[PDB]
Motif scaffolding. Sequence first.
Motif, PDB file in Angstrom:
ATOM      1  N   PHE A 223     167.113  11.514  -8.783  1.00 45.34           N
ATOM      2  CA  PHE A 223     166.177  12.511  -8.279  1.00 45.34           C
ATOM      3  C   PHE A 223     166.913  13.690  -7.658  1.00 45.34           C
ATOM      4  CE2 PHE A 223     162.797  14.307  -5.799  1.00 45.34           C
ATOM      5  CZ  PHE A 223     161.690  14.092  -6.578  1.00 45.34           C
ATOM      6  N   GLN A 224     167.878  13.414  -6.781  1.00 50.81           N
ATOM      7  CA  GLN A 224     168.649  14.499  -6.187  1.00 50.81           C
ATOM      8  C   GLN A 224     169.371  15.297  -7.259  1.00 50.81           C
ATOM      9  OE1 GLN A 224     168.935  15.251  -2.817  1.00 50.81           O
ATOM     10  NE2 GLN A 224     167.503  13.640  -2.192  1.00 50.81           N
ATOM     11  N   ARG A 225     169.958  14.611  -8.237  1.00 56.89           N
ATOM     12  CA  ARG A 225     170.653  15.317  -9.304  1.00 56.89           C
ATOM     13  C   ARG A 225     169.690  16.159 -10.126  1.00 56.89           C
ATOM     14  NH1 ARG A 225     174.723  18.316 -10.601  1.00 56.89           N
ATOM     15  NH2 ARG A 225     174.478  18.812 -12.821  1.00 56.89           N
ATOM     16  N   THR A 226     168.524  15.613 -10.457  1.00 51.61           N
ATOM     17  CA  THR A 226     167.580  16.381 -11.254  1.00 51.61           C
ATOM     18  C   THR A 226     166.854  17.441 -10.440  1.00 51.61           C
ATOM     19  OG1 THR A 226     167.284  14.404 -12.594  1.00 51.61           O
ATOM     20  CG2 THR A 226     165.785  16.189 -12.970  1.00 51.61           C
ATOM     21  N   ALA A 227     166.738  17.265  -9.125  1.00 51.29           N
ATOM     22  CA  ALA A 227     166.162  18.320  -8.300  1.00 51.29           C
ATOM     23  C   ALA A 227     167.033  19.566  -8.304  1.00 51.29           C
ATOM     24  CB  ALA A 227     165.960  17.824  -6.872  1.00 51.29           C
ATOM     25  N   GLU A 228     168.349  19.395  -8.190  1.00 54.36           N
ATOM     26  CA  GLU A 228     169.244  20.547  -8.193  1.00 54.36           C
ATOM     27  C   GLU A 228     169.141  21.315  -9.499  1.00 54.36           C
ATOM     28  OE1 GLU A 228     173.565  19.919  -6.908  1.00 54.36           O
ATOM     29  OE2 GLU A 228     172.405  19.151  -5.214  1.00 54.36           O
ATOM     30  N   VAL A 229     169.076  20.604 -10.622  1.00 51.57           N
ATOM     31  CA  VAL A 229     169.031  21.276 -11.914  1.00 51.57           C
ATOM     32  C   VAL A 229     167.713  22.018 -12.089  1.00 51.57           C
ATOM     33  CG1 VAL A 229     168.752  20.833 -14.346  1.00 51.57           C
ATOM     34  CG2 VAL A 229     170.739  19.949 -13.157  1.00 51.57           C
ATOM     35  N   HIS A 230     166.595  21.350 -11.817  1.00 55.01           N
ATOM     36  CA  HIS A 230     165.310  22.023 -11.955  1.00 55.01           C
ATOM     37  C   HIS A 230     165.143  23.132 -10.931  1.00 55.01           C
ATOM     38  CE1 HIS A 230     161.020  22.766 -11.440  1.00 55.01           C
ATOM     39  NE2 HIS A 230     160.848  22.316 -12.669  1.00 55.01           N
ATOM     40  N   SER A 231     165.914  23.097  -9.847  1.00 61.10           N
ATOM     41  CA  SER A 231     165.973  24.245  -8.952  1.00 61.10           C
ATOM     42  C   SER A 231     166.699  25.410  -9.605  1.00 61.10           C
ATOM     43  CB  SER A 231     166.664  23.860  -7.651  1.00 61.10           C
ATOM     44  OG  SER A 231     167.059  25.016  -6.942  1.00 61.10           O
ATOM     45  N   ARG A 232     167.871  25.146 -10.178  1.00 65.39           N
ATOM     46  CA  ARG A 232     168.667  26.219 -10.756  1.00 65.39           C
ATOM     47  C   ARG A 232     167.959  26.852 -11.942  1.00 65.39           C
ATOM     48  NH1 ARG A 232     174.005  28.041 -11.015  1.00 65.39           N
ATOM     49  NH2 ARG A 232     174.332  26.679  -9.206  1.00 65.39           N
ATOM     50  N   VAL A 233     167.332  26.038 -12.791  1.00 64.21           N
ATOM     51  CA  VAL A 233     166.625  26.589 -13.942  1.00 64.21           C
ATOM     52  C   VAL A 233     165.481  27.481 -13.486  1.00 64.21           C
ATOM     53  CG1 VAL A 233     165.153  26.012 -15.872  1.00 64.21           C
ATOM     54  CG2 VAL A 233     167.302  24.826 -15.569  1.00 64.21           C
ATOM     55  N   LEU A 234     164.740  27.048 -12.467  1.00 63.41           N
ATOM     56  CA  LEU A 234     163.684  27.894 -11.925  1.00 63.41           C
ATOM     57  C   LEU A 234     164.259  29.164 -11.321  1.00 63.41           C
ATOM     58  CD1 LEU A 234     160.877  28.482 -11.449  1.00 63.41           C
ATOM     59  CD2 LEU A 234     160.805  26.939  -9.528  1.00 63.41           C
ATOM     60  N   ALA A 235     165.399  29.058 -10.637  1.00 64.94           N
ATOM     61  CA  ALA A 235     166.029  30.249 -10.076  1.00 64.94           C
ATOM     62  C   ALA A 235     166.441  31.214 -11.175  1.00 64.94           C
ATOM     63  CB  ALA A 235     167.236  29.860  -9.225  1.00 64.94           C
ATOM     64  N   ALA A 236     167.150  30.717 -12.186  1.00 66.81           N
ATOM     65  CA  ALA A 236     167.575  31.594 -13.267  1.00 66.81           C
ATOM     66  C   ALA A 236     166.388  32.150 -14.033  1.00 66.81           C
ATOM     67  CB  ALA A 236     168.514  30.852 -14.212  1.00 66.81           C
ATOM     68  N   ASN A 237     165.210  31.550 -13.881  1.00 69.34           N
ATOM     69  CA  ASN A 237     164.037  32.082 -14.562  1.00 69.34           C
ATOM     70  C   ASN A 237     163.399  33.216 -13.773  1.00 69.34           C
ATOM     71  OD1 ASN A 237     162.746  31.704 -17.062  1.00 69.34           O
ATOM     72  ND2 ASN A 237     160.948  30.839 -16.040  1.00 69.34           N
ATOM     73  N   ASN A 238     163.759  33.363 -12.496  1.00 69.58           N
ATOM     74  CA  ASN A 238     163.219  34.467 -11.712  1.00 69.58           C
ATOM     75  C   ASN A 238     164.190  35.632 -11.634  1.00 69.58           C
ATOM     76  OD1 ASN A 238     160.885  33.080 -11.264  1.00 69.58           O
ATOM     77  ND2 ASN A 238     161.434  32.418  -9.195  1.00 69.58           N
ATOM     78  N   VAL A 239     165.481  35.351 -11.462  1.00 70.32           N
ATOM     79  CA  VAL A 239     166.462  36.427 -11.396  1.00 70.32           C
ATOM     80  C   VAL A 239     166.431  37.245 -12.678  1.00 70.32           C
ATOM     81  CG1 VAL A 239     168.910  36.788 -11.618  1.00 70.32           C
ATOM     82  CG2 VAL A 239     168.043  35.670  -9.621  1.00 70.32           C
ATOM     83  N   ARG A 240     166.247  36.582 -13.820  1.00 71.83           N
ATOM     84  CA  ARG A 240     166.151  37.301 -15.086  1.00 71.83           C
ATOM     85  C   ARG A 240     165.019  38.317 -15.059  1.00 71.83           C
ATOM     86  NH1 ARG A 240     165.579  33.273 -17.778  1.00 71.83           N
ATOM     87  NH2 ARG A 240     167.415  33.083 -19.129  1.00 71.83           N
ATOM     88  N   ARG A 241     163.866  37.937 -14.512  1.00 69.50           N
ATOM     89  CA  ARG A 241     162.750  38.865 -14.421  1.00 69.50           C
ATOM     90  C   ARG A 241     163.026  40.019 -13.471  1.00 69.50           C
ATOM     91  NH1 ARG A 241     157.473  40.016 -16.147  1.00 69.50           N
ATOM     92  NH2 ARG A 241     156.709  39.612 -14.029  1.00 69.50           N
ATOM     93  N   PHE A 242     164.048  39.910 -12.627  1.00 70.01           N
ATOM     94  CA  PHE A 242     164.382  40.963 -11.680  1.00 70.01           C
ATOM     95  C   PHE A 242     165.539  41.838 -12.133  1.00 70.01           C
ATOM     96  CE2 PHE A 242     166.207  42.418  -7.542  1.00 70.01           C
ATOM     97  CZ  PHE A 242     165.144  43.198  -7.175  1.00 70.01           C
ATOM     98  N   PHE A 243     166.374  41.358 -13.053  1.00 69.46           N
ATOM     99  CA  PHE A 243     167.508  42.119 -13.551  1.00 69.46           C
ATOM    100  C   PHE A 243     167.500  42.336 -15.056  1.00 69.46           C
ATOM    101  CE2 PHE A 243     170.915  41.411 -10.062  1.00 69.46           C
ATOM    102  CZ  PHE A 243     170.259  42.319  -9.282  1.00 69.46           C
ATOM    103  N   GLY A 244     166.695  41.593 -15.809  1.00 68.12           N
ATOM    104  CA  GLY A 244     166.734  41.643 -17.250  1.00 68.12           C
ATOM    105  C   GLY A 244     167.698  40.671 -17.891  1.00 68.12           C
ATOM    106  N   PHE A 245     168.509  39.977 -17.099  1.00 69.91           N
ATOM    107  CA  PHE A 245     169.486  39.021 -17.596  1.00 69.91           C
ATOM    108  C   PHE A 245     170.004  38.233 -16.403  1.00 69.91           C
ATOM    109  CE2 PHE A 245     173.677  40.616 -16.305  1.00 69.91           C
ATOM    110  CZ  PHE A 245     173.263  41.757 -15.669  1.00 69.91           C
ATOM    111  N   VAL A 246     170.680  37.123 -16.682  1.00 70.15           N
ATOM    112  CA  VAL A 246     171.171  36.233 -15.637  1.00 70.15           C
ATOM    113  C   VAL A 246     172.618  35.880 -15.936  1.00 70.15           C
ATOM    114  CG1 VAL A 246     171.117  33.860 -14.863  1.00 70.15           C
ATOM    115  CG2 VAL A 246     169.066  35.238 -14.775  1.00 70.15           C
ATOM    116  N   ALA A 247     173.480  35.992 -14.931  1.00 67.10           N
ATOM    117  CA  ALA A 247     174.873  35.604 -15.090  1.00 67.10           C
ATOM    118  C   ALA A 247     175.008  34.106 -14.859  1.00 67.10           C
ATOM    119  CB  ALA A 247     175.764  36.380 -14.124  1.00 67.10           C
TER     120      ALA A 247
END
Lengths: 270, 269, 272, 269, 288, 263, 263
Positions: free
Chosen positions: A195-219
């Motif tokens: 759960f802890q391992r999958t929480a971190e990943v589903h956090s990062r994927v959600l994060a990279a899904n918002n930063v892209r909408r703010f910059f047009g791309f994600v590093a």
Amino acid sequence: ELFSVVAFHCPCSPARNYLYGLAAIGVPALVLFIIGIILNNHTWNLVAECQHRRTKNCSAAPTFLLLSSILGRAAVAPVTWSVISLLRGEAYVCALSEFVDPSSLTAREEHFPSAHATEILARFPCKENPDNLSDFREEVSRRLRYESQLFGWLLIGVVAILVFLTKCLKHYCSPLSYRQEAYWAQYRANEDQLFQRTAEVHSRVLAANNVRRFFGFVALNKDDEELIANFPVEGTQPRPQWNAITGVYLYRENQGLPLYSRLHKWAQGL
Amino acid sequence: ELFSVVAFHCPCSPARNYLYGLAAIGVPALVLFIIGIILNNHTWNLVAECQHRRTKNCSAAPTFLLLSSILGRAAVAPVTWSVISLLRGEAYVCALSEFVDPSSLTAREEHFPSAHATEILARFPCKENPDNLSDFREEVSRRLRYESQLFGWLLIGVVAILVFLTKCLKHYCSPLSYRQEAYWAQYRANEDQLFQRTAEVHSRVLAANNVRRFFGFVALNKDDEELIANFPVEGTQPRPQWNAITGVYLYRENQGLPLYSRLHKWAQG
Amino acid sequence: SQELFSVVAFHCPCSPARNYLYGLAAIGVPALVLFIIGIILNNHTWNLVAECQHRRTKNCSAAPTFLLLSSILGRAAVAPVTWSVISLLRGEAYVCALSEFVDPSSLTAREEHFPSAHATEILARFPCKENPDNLSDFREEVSRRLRYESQLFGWLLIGVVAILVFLTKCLKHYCSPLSYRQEAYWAQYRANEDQLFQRTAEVHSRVLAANNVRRFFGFVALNKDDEELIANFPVEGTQPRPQWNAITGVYLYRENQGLPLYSRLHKWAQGL
Amino acid sequence: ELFSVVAFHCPCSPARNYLYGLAAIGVPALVLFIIGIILNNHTWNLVAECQHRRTKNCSAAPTFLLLSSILGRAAVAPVTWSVISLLRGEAYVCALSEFVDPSSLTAREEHFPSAHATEILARFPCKENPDNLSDFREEVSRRLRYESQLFGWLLIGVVAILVFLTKCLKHYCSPLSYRQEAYWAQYRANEDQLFQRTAEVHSRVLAANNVRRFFGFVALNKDDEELIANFPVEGTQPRPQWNAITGVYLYRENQGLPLYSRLHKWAQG
Amino acid sequence: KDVMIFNGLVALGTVGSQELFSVVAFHCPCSPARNYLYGLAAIGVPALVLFIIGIILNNHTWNLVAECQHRRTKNCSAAPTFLLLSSILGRAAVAPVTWSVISLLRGEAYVCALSEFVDPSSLTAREEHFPSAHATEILARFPCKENPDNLSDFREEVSRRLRYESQLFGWLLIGVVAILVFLTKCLKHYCSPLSYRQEAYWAQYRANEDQLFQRTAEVHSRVLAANNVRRFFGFVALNKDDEELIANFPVEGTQPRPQWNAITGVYLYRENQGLPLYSRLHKWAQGL
Amino acid sequence: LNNIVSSLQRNGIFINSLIAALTIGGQQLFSSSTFSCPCQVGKNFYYGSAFLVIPALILLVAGFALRSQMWTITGEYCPLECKLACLRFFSITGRAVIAPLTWLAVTLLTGTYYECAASEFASVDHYPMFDNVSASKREEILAGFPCCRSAPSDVILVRDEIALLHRYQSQMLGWILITLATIAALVSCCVAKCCSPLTSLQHCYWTSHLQNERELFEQAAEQHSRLLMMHRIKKLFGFIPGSEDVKHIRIPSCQDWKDISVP
Amino acid sequence: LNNIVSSLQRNGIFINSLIAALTIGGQQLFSSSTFSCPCQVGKNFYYGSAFLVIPALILLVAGFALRSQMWTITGEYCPLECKLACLRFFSITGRAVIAPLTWLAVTLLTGTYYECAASEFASVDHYPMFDNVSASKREEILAGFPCCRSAPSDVILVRDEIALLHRYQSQMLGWILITLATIAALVSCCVAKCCSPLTSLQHCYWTSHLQNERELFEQAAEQHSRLLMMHRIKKLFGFIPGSEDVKHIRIPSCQDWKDISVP
């Protein structure tokens, strides 16, 4: 020299050192005890249990069987500090050097003065004793150290019995055989680490899904690019869904089959 | 240094150190003894036997063979600590310093004071004695150390005889040729390795199938993917099914072919 | 660095009504300096400032500010405490401060040989060893009672903090509407968004710098790894200030359609 | 070594050492202050800005905040050297040795001579004092060294508050959210690194054409030909165009979109 | 940058040499009106000399002379002269200053100088005790540290007051050079016709061209020599690298004498119809 | 890596610095080992003066002679050619004269050589101690104390003063010489940048060309000699050495050895 | 790396410096070990003089003889050929004579050999101490003190003065010799740059060519001998050694061994 700072320094003064003996042994014990409670995840889902019901309908029968575990998994840390100090003997001898009876000293004739017996006995831990009483101090120092070292060994014995007593009751009163509990023990850790391992990943994927909408791309790093390419997300997990996997779970059987975690109870759709 | 923490410091005092020496050696033996019972799985299933029946149906005599195994296996820890302390001799000399008879003292003429006997003898282990009695101090130090080592060498001798009698009688009265018992003892220690190994795998697989239904996917390493792919889980095993593979088992034979472990008995339905 | 440590090390001025001023400065000021560093590095204090700047009307009440303000000090007041505590346990600071306040009659270990000519002056000289040999017993006696009074407070201070931390942690979980487990994900989200943001801000910075240099020099020089950056991450322009203005500010869990939003940026990503 | 040469040597002489203390502290501070201004790039375009206008066309108020940046960045060296001297205390005792009031002296009965109060008080820091007044030389030194350390701690405190005060107001009074300043700062550093990097490549290629035009060829290392081939020069760049991308720059918006530097303003056409 | 490290090694070089010099060979001649001249020469002579090798080793110096001899009219503009003069001094005049300050800072050079001028009546802490005839002579023997213990009391104050003057004087010198460098840099940018980015690009280009020029010139010498070897033997023996150069670098021949003269001297920075020219060499190529 | 060392070897400043350091070390070793300061009254100035001059002269001659190109310069000596010869001569002289200048400077700075050299030339009429109505013992003791003779008869302090004076003068001379040398260099450089017809870049390129062509022609001459000898063997023995000889062999007789003895 | 060492070995200055250093070290070891300065009154000048001359002569002869080409020069001796022989002889002489010059210079500079050599030749009529109406004991003591005999009878100071004087003279001679040597070198070089018909570059090229062709012809002669022996074996035993012998074998008889015994 961090350990050098916390080193014991016995203040040789009547009616004063035993306070210092308490507050230089009890307080680190209290600090160690508190840390045990805070880091123990089994204490939060206990708090969140009474939080969300807001009524405390549940009785003390299910709480006490868990509450002992909360302290038990945490009370070991103060004891392995309390016993260590007693074995060293420094904590006790400075604490109780004031109370030594001026009539109970041996290995020397009646040379103890009676002007200020408590005062002169108070300074024994600091070795600031006149050489005419060096026999007396090496008698009181070795006698008091016995009392500590006796108490320390006895305390280890009491834990050495309470653990065996508890481990027997926890296997004689529970309705499950130990071989099944080991599975139930090997499942709580197996799920939580996933759960802890999958929480971190589903956090990062959600994060990279918002930063892209703010910059047009994600590093993203080379290995992190695999994460987005594999675990897409569609949104967020609703709060009531997050509220059904928090709390205390007590072996609720379902249709003749067992469930081992409160999450599992929700997994079947219950 | 934890060696300095658990060091044996002798409190030289009459009627006081033997009480200390009793609690400075016996108590670690008690802790060592407690550890042996707790870790040995042969005692939980014996406990688990007492819980399911709730009636005391099983007789004590068949269980005494296994009951002697848990105590016997765990008995190494007290013996290997009681003996080591005895041979070192520090524990005994401080314990029995105050019981030495001044009249029976040797190596010197009858100049031993008797005004306060026990007080001086009690101080022997700490070397806090006037040099006028150094010969006496050394004489008692050697004699007392002798009894410890003689007791220590006697203790290890007794254990060796007990082991010899135990193993010789165990093989004689067991109803299986000792070669078969080796295979059996190579089974229970082999099943438990596999059973523990799949306990995690069928746990982790059941862990992933729960998180996935919640999050929508499961984070895994390269190896863990093989666990999910190769070994799929469908549900959980019933609680009575778990109840049938815990307890003691004593060579119940089927049809003329042995069943070596209670799980094997259940594997035949 | 042995020279740098020697500069900061305590040098007690044995003089009346003077050392405890220095003792106040030799501990208070480094605590104040550490505390200020704690405020600035705490990213939560800036969007707190930015919240008080953009609205210009004090829209938020005390409760939204109080809940965050506790986190500002808590993540920062650690540094002064672990410095104040370490000083008290050492005891040098305290004994220098109160060396001129022990009552002469309260002294022991020696008869009434303590001079009463200028009591405050001779007492103040104890920490710097500057004491007559005939009062060396008194010097040690005060050198221990004051060490004690520091050490007891040092241990007592740690105990009080170890209660407040436990009390604060317990109250937050019981008061917040979220389950404790969902907060862990929420904490695991702010870190991921921030780290991705800062890392991806650099790349969208360098690309803009590369694009502008090219128009001037006629071309751009890039390293081996930067060459991939230009092709893989092309930009078309900049981002308006109001867009930059919707993601800098304190955010407290505005749920949307029954589905949570975990940061200002996430709320903006839904166009709300 | 170098530290031996620049080692403080207190001239024990009245009305004279405090001049030395000022120069032995102020001049190292003044020198270090200059290096702060000289190396800083924001100070030259500030000067270069006055070159093009030559008539104070732009108001001083908008340019004031840059002047706050140039002094603040440069002031680290003088403070970190002023503070170190104060905490060391050597500078201050020699500075104020001869100003200690004999009346306020303590820790000794009144044996202080008044024939040459300043002179004998001047010689204290250099061990050139009567041993009968050695306790005074310890008393005066400790009081003066106390004053130095208090000023040092007060100074570092005020710098600590001013750093916070000038960083709390800067975010408050700036028209941009702090995150935009994060991007803006990361853009400026990226621009300068890329701008300077291309200058080496552009020069080396341009110089190759001139040398090639005059020897008929050029001698090149392994990567120079790659530089020549990949980045050919078609000429140079007019001076007034260079002038448009020099000087200070305030945040100015174009069609609702920001421009973070003059070079960006130039690149937008 | 490269310039700072180049200066830093020189500054370390003289300081170490000064430390070495102050140990092996410095003995103040305790003779009236002899140490004074000795003291002054102990500072200026290394200072004046060290300034000289700074001028000689500077390549740009002869560039100034070449134009001055060629033009005979000093037609060079103020700005390029400001560049070169502030370049040679910033690269050469640093060494004497560092030697001058450290010599003052240590004080053993100065303490010899004004030892003659010390006023016997200016002494304090005791009544003046010096004969009217040997007062100057006895003072001259103070720096030798061979003075009798009776005169030790008066000697330490005198040997320190001058040492006070030296360190104060040495510090004051640092202030002047530090101010001047700050003053010059502002004057350099204020009076320059081009912004500092241009100045950075131009000076950065000047190093690259001359570095390219030197490498090519050595190669051009080898290829030209090799071709003449072929004409004189009918064959040439070359290693792997040089043989590649002759096949890759055709020999243009000998450049006209005025062409070589046109690429030496000062830079007029005449914009080619608005297109900048960053050296005479660049102008020559763009000119033709 | 070794290419960098050779590149720095081509730097003339580095090689001159190496020469100066080596000369200073050799002078220090020579002074500490084999000087001994002979103390004879008659001719003591001769010894010190010779120690000053002869090493300088021999170092100067060695520096001038060890450069082979100066032999060619002299042979040409014994328009533009004169200017080129003058430029090359000045450039070679610089390195030829750097070492003796270093020796003189370091010797004067140390001062021992001058101390033992002009010791008997000291002025003693100012000192009232040296009456010496004989007028001969005065010179004897004057030459006698500076070498190793303390002679503790109150004269020691006097002698130290005398020594100091001479030492002081020595230092000045050294620095004086140094000053003059530098001045000379400057004006010398002026000539090399005033009478030179070539450009500043032209001179360096021309020198590099000269060195390159000298080395190239030396290599070509060696190769031509090798080819000529190869041809001689392939015409005498009938085979090319170093190649497949199994084809033919001349088997030369006694008369054939005489023919190859011509060169 | 070892190629660089061989390249510096080809540098004549380096090899001459190595020779000089080795000779100086050997002289120092010989003096410190096996000199002992015999103190006999009769013939003591003989010992020191021989120590001075014989090592120099043997070193000179060894330097002249160890060069093989001088044997060929003498054989040719016993137009342009005469000039070339003279040039080669001068060039070889230089290295032949450098070492004995070094020995003489270092011995004179040390001064011990000259000290023990001409000690009995000292002038003592100036000193009034040495009356010696016998006129024979004077020479005996004069030869007796310089070696190891202190003889503390007030004469020691006198003897030191005498020693000093001789030592002083020794130094001069050394330097005097040095001066002359250098002068000789210069004029010798003049001849090599005046009577030489070849150009300065021509001489070096020609010498390199001579060394190349000598080495090439030596290698060719060795290879020709190897091929001749190979041919002898392939004609006697019928097979080429070092190749596939499994084809044929002669199996020679007793008479065949005699034929190969001819050379």
